[PDB]
Design an enzyme around this catalytic site. Structure first.
Site, mmCIF file in Angstrom:
data_model
loop_
_atom_site.group_PDB
_atom_site.id
_atom_site.type_symbol
_atom_site.label_atom_id
_atom_site.label_comp_id
_atom_site.label_asym_id
_atom_site.label_seq_id
_atom_site.Cartn_x
_atom_site.Cartn_y
_atom_site.Cartn_z
ATOM 1 N N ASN A 123 -40.756 15.390 -44.696
ATOM 2 C CA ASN A 123 -41.194 15.511 -46.064
ATOM 3 C C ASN A 123 -40.261 14.600 -46.813
ATOM 4 O O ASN A 123 -39.041 14.811 -46.840
ATOM 5 C CB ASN A 123 -41.093 16.936 -46.595
ATOM 6 C CG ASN A 123 -42.228 17.854 -46.195
ATOM 7 O OD1 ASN A 123 -43.227 17.464 -45.581
ATOM 8 N ND2 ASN A 123 -42.083 19.115 -46.542
ATOM 9 N N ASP A 334 -19.354 -19.022 -21.656
ATOM 10 C CA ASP A 334 -19.416 -19.997 -20.560
ATOM 11 C C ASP A 334 -19.630 -21.412 -21.129
ATOM 12 O O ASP A 334 -18.790 -21.841 -21.918
ATOM 13 C CB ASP A 334 -20.442 -19.557 -19.471
ATOM 14 C CG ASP A 334 -20.492 -20.440 -18.240
ATOM 15 O OD1 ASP A 334 -19.531 -20.411 -17.456
ATOM 16 O OD2 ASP A 334 -21.445 -21.232 -18.123
ATOM 17 N N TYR A 465 -23.280 -29.702 -16.514
ATOM 18 C CA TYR A 465 -22.091 -29.958 -15.674
ATOM 19 C C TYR A 465 -21.992 -31.417 -15.236
ATOM 20 O O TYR A 465 -21.026 -31.785 -14.566
ATOM 21 C CB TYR A 465 -22.189 -29.144 -14.375
ATOM 22 C CG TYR A 465 -21.904 -27.669 -14.509
ATOM 23 C CD1 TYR A 465 -20.601 -27.182 -14.454
ATOM 24 C CD2 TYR A 465 -22.940 -26.748 -14.625
ATOM 25 C CE1 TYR A 465 -20.338 -25.816 -14.511
ATOM 26 C CE2 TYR A 465 -22.688 -25.380 -14.687
ATOM 27 C CZ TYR A 465 -21.387 -24.924 -14.643
ATOM 28 O OH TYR A 465 -21.140 -23.591 -14.743
ATOM 29 N N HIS A 523 -17.409 -12.254 -14.944
ATOM 30 C CA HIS A 523 -17.887 -13.434 -15.664
ATOM 31 C C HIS A 523 -19.027 -13.151 -16.644
ATOM 32 O O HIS A 523 -19.071 -13.755 -17.713
ATOM 33 C CB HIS A 523 -18.320 -14.524 -14.673
ATOM 34 C CG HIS A 523 -18.898 -15.724 -15.355
ATOM 35 N ND1 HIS A 523 -18.094 -16.594 -16.073
ATOM 36 C CD2 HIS A 523 -20.190 -16.099 -15.498
ATOM 37 C CE1 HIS A 523 -18.914 -17.482 -16.598
ATOM 38 N NE2 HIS A 523 -20.184 -17.231 -16.272
HETATM 39 C C1 LIG Z 1 -17.454 -14.107 -7.602
HETATM 40 C C2 LIG Z 1 -18.661 -14.368 -8.459
HETATM 41 C C3 LIG Z 1 -18.144 -14.820 -9.774
HETATM 42 C C4 LIG Z 1 -19.325 -15.383 -10.438
HETATM 43 C C5 LIG Z 1 -19.066 -16.523 -11.318
HETATM 44 N N1 LIG Z 1 -17.888 -16.558 -12.115
HETATM 45 C C6 LIG Z 1 -17.759 -17.594 -12.909
HETATM 46 N N2 LIG Z 1 -16.755 -17.700 -13.784
HETATM 47 N N3 LIG Z 1 -16.856 -18.865 -14.492
HETATM 48 C C7 LIG Z 1 -17.992 -19.540 -14.069
HETATM 49 N N4 LIG Z 1 -18.510 -20.709 -14.518
HETATM 50 C C8 LIG Z 1 -18.622 -18.721 -13.042
HETATM 51 C C9 LIG Z 1 -19.812 -18.764 -12.219
HETATM 52 C C10 LIG Z 1 -20.084 -17.580 -11.288
HETATM 53 C C11 LIG Z 1 -21.368 -17.528 -10.372
HETATM 54 S S1 LIG Z 1 -21.695 -19.199 -9.695
HETATM 55 C C12 LIG Z 1 -22.009 -19.951 -11.419
HETATM 56 C C13 LIG Z 1 -23.083 -19.291 -12.229
HETATM 57 C C14 LIG Z 1 -22.393 -21.369 -11.222
HETATM 58 C C15 LIG Z 1 -20.781 -19.959 -12.302
#
Ligand SMILES: CCCCc1nc2[nH]nc(N)c2c2c1CSC(C)(C)C2
Ligand SMILES: CCCCc1nc2[nH]nc(N)c2c2c1CSC(C)(C)C2
Lengths: 546, 546
Positions: A123, A334, A465, A523
């Site tokens: 209400n 990233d 990259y 990550h």
């Molecule tokens: C042990 C798994 C860690 C995963 C991992 N850590 C990270 N930290 N910094 C980064 N660019 C990076 C990456 C990964 C996965 S491969 C990819 C995506 C190319 C980059």
């Protein structure tokens, strides 16, 4: 067997209840008991308050008819209203004091998660007060979590009239027996009972919730901390801007206030920010979650040089120009985090504030080839595997489901051996063909990235990259500069490539730098620790972004 | 034969010149002449100011090196700097005092209109001051009007070094002889002269403009008042929101600040607001120019009931919900103006402010069929012709170019005989097969509406007029209410259907109503009188919308 839960707004999903303010007002002013509370219900179904609740009149039209009813009620009681007694002031403060009852919303959330149809039945009035926005905001925050919002003023019906109950059942498409109904007012609860709906008189939330879990058989009290609100892609506002003849940039947009531009990393999406988008918008920000160039609905040109930092930063400036935004706070993760630092170094007039998750700011070494620098760190070996065009594309595009399932995992779900990667022959060489589902993601969320990456693949993303030399040369032009705009660096304890110690010398170039640190975070920061990411960013945004 | 015009920023497109502030500072502080002005140019090409202009360092890094140069310069002159002399304060105020030189921008605009390539070439810095946004805003406003913006700090070159001149010519893709170059600094003007570029030393704007029109042969001084900035569709940010499984709404978005939702009329586009969009965004607003349901890139469901006011208003609320907007100021014209009044009556919590062009607010008569009310007015006969499905569609869809050319005309270009329309057999029965182009529109703008209307046609748009009974019944529920939120009613003297006198009783229902009146304005308000529409709306927005 229940399949629907219905909640009242005042005193149920929102506290303190606005009703209980006439009582507190009497007590504070030493006025006769229920003097205001009955001037409020003056004339019952034909009174000013009923017309207000049916939408016959607005709240502003109502204020002076309530004041009148307060006069008449004092007359009969033989008492006198203060000096500057204000119905408007009383109600403004009470509406403003009323906040969401978070445990009640959490239970409604959990019930909807467990297949229930949820609804708010209330209400309410048509609010045209100069300060109506505060309530509009609360209704927007609440309503998104429910299948239905039934407002009395909008349907022309009112509790406790039984037609609103039959209206409620018809909108639910369910029999009264499949329905739980919560209300703090016994009289409004009674017609729902009379129909055979399961009802709960809500006094204290805790008791109401014990009654609710008893009746549903679903645990709602003492539940683990929930995840923040996520995004359903088809419910978002999708934005498109042509930054140059062949490049269009896609973004998701939510909220109002200062512009906050979210820049994802490799190989992600605007969707990597799903837990941050509703939270940041709720905190008073206009969120622009990008699909960075080479990703999702954004253009993915084949050329390597199209992904060098200089052009990527320049296209982000055009993006702001085309949107008519003089500035935006830039938040990156990233590769996005790297872009974000360069935007601050090359375009500080366009960046309100800069924040990075995991990606540190390290000045370019003019005495070393960026290839020599990448070779100096064993964990950066995957970057060299990424150099040769077509190689990483072939492995990454072979099975998209396997790719994202193998990548998107927490620090305790390790499937990759980031060491001697080009030597091993790839990223997933020691990785299973059918990886298990990480706890960070659902299968549905994996299929979203899978569907997104089907349009353009990994060529454009990997090209990010492939400009190490170009980026280095361009960065060397900023070596005399310092970042003197508000900045935040957030480290993730368990990122084994972008390690927290890599950020240690940042104050030499960013003296006023603020920090955040997330423990037990890998990550994939945003989906790994969404609750603390939001907490760190909101706190930083409110203190340093304006 | 000239084909390019190049302008300096400081002292040319922007006034007062920041340079001239060291001179005014000396004069105000009774300091020796040129004391500050030479502490500024201390070390010439190797000095702090040159590094700043090349982008070696930022403005914040520069402040203390200039202060140092001010110390040394006073020493030699044997004078003393005040007490709380501040380089930062001097520069903040000077940058802030600097505004666009409107007649200079108008000439650049006119030259670009007459086929010229225009560019800004300026010695500037990388601004990281806490107050850098004010300048960023000025640069965004200026730059949109030019083909190129060459900033010294971004190219690493500086005037008067000759490489910046060769850089300028290369970016223009033209020989020095096809180029006019304006600068207030004789020394910066000299290398352009030396190359054979036509140069103008700019002291006063008027003399500089007389020199400019003499050299180009294009009239730039004493020119009639220009039209406001328009929109090029391919340069806009395009937004899409799904409001229900089958309905998606398209909008154009520009600027930051409070959300202003623009709602066009029949048979229009988001593009009907082209002259208002850049102006409102420039005035500090976040513009959302809609393609209303049944139009352009928005969904056009075939059903009549999909276009009744109740559903249209409800979808506009969902649109705000999905965008995370608690409120928006709603500005409508024609059918959009009608929707806008209902949004205020049914959802005042979601409307910051309401404004209508031409469309008055008239409460529904419960003692008369809306069909009886439409029959009572001879000018509303076209509404009856619109009732029968397929009829008006056939006439309107036969030749789209003829349709918009016949409709979109000023009050002195009358081609239609709005009288006895269903009897005449249609809208264009006495209208030419090949109507002349109205002065309000270009052929290009006509072809935009033509292309937009090719997707869905006139069924959905015409369905807006096919819910007279449904709208009436729904409106009768709001008869006890009043509009007490900020509201603006703008009348157009020459709208012969939505006559100004139709709005005369509006204060009986909207007591705090504000007005605007446009003389010599027909029905197509926005493109007929764009300059005054913008002036009325901006003034109202700043006073009543916040
Ligand atoms: C042990 C798994 C860690 C995963 C991992 N850590 C990270 N930290 N910094 C980064 N660019 C990076 C990456 C990964 C996965 S491969 C990819 C995506 C190319 C980059
Ligand atoms: C003499 C020409 C006046 C043009 C004109 N004025 C109007 N005023 N209010 C209106 N709905 C309206 C219309 C027209 C053109 S026909 C149509 C678009 C259907 C509506």
């Amino acid at each position: 067997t229940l399949r629907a839960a219905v909640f009242d707004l005042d005193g149920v999903l929102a506290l303190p209840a606005v009703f209980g303010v006439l009582g507190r007002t009497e007590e504070a002013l030493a006025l006769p008991r229920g003097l205001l509370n009955d001037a409020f219900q003056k004339g019952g179904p034909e009174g000013a308050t009923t017309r207000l609740m049916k939408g016959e009149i607005t709240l502003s039209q109502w204020i002076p008819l309530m004041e009148e009813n307060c006069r008449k009620c004092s007359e009969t009681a033989k008492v006198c209203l203060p000096k500057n007694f204000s119905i408007k002031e009383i109600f403004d403060k009470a509406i403003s004091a009323r906040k969401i009852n978070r445990p009640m919303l959490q239970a409604a959330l959990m019930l909807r998660k467990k297949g229930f149809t949820t609804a708010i039945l209330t209400n309410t009035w048509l609010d045209d007060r100069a300060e109506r926005d505060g309530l509009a905001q609360l209704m927007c925050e609440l309503k998104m979590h429910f299948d239905f919002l039934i407002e009395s003023c909008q349907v022309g019906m009112v509790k406790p009239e039984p037609q609103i109950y039959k209206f409620l059942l018809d909108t639910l498409k369910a029999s009264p027996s499949e329905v739980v109904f919560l209300d703090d007012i016994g009289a409004n609860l009674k017609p729902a009972r009379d129909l055979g709906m399961v009802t709960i008189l809500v006094q204290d939330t805790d008791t109401a919730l014990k009654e609710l879990e008893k009746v549903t058989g679903i645990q709602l009290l003492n539940t683990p901390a929930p995840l923040p609100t996520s995004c359903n892609p088809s419910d978002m506002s999708h934005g498109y801007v042509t930054v140059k003849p062949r490049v269009r940039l896609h973004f998701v947009e939510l909220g109002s206030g200062p512009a906050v531009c979210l820049c994802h990393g490799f190989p992600e999406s605007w969707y990597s920010w799903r837990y941050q988008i509703p939270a940041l918008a709720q905190a008073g920000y206009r969120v622009l979650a990008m699909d960075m160039k080479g990703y999702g609905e954004s253009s993915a040109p084949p050329e390597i040089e199209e992904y060098c930092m200089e052009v990527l930063c320049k296209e982000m400036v055009t993006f702001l120009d085309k949107l008519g935004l003089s500035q935006a706070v830039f938040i990156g993760h990233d590769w996005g985090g790297m872009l974000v630092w360069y935007m601050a170094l090359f375009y500080p007039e366009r960046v309100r504030a800069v924040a990075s998750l995991n990606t540190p700011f390290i000045p370019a070494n003019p005495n070393m080839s960026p290839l020599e620098s990448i070779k100096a760190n064993p964990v950066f070996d995957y970057q060299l595997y990424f150099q040769e065009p077509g190689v990483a594309e072939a492995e990454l595009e072979q099975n998209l489901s396997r790719t994202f399932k193998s990548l998107f995992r927490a620090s305790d779900e390790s499937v990759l051996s980031m060491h001697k990667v080009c030597e091993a022959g790839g990223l997933f060489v020691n990785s299973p063909e059918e990886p298990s589902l990480s706890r960070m993601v659902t299968e549905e969320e994996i299929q979203f990235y899978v569907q997104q990456f089907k349009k353009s693949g990994f060529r454009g993303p990997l090209n990010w990259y492939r400009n190490m030399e170009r980026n280095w040369k361009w960065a060397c032009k900023s070596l005399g500069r310092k970042i003197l705009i508000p900045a935040l660096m957030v480290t993730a304890e368990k990122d084994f490539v972008l390690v927290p110690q890599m950020s240690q010398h940042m104050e030499d170039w960013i003296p006023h730098l603020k920090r955040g640190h997330i423990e037990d975070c890998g990550h994939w920061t945003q989906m790994d620790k969404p609750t603390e990411v939001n907490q760190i960013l909101i706190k930083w945004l409110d203190s340093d972004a304006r």
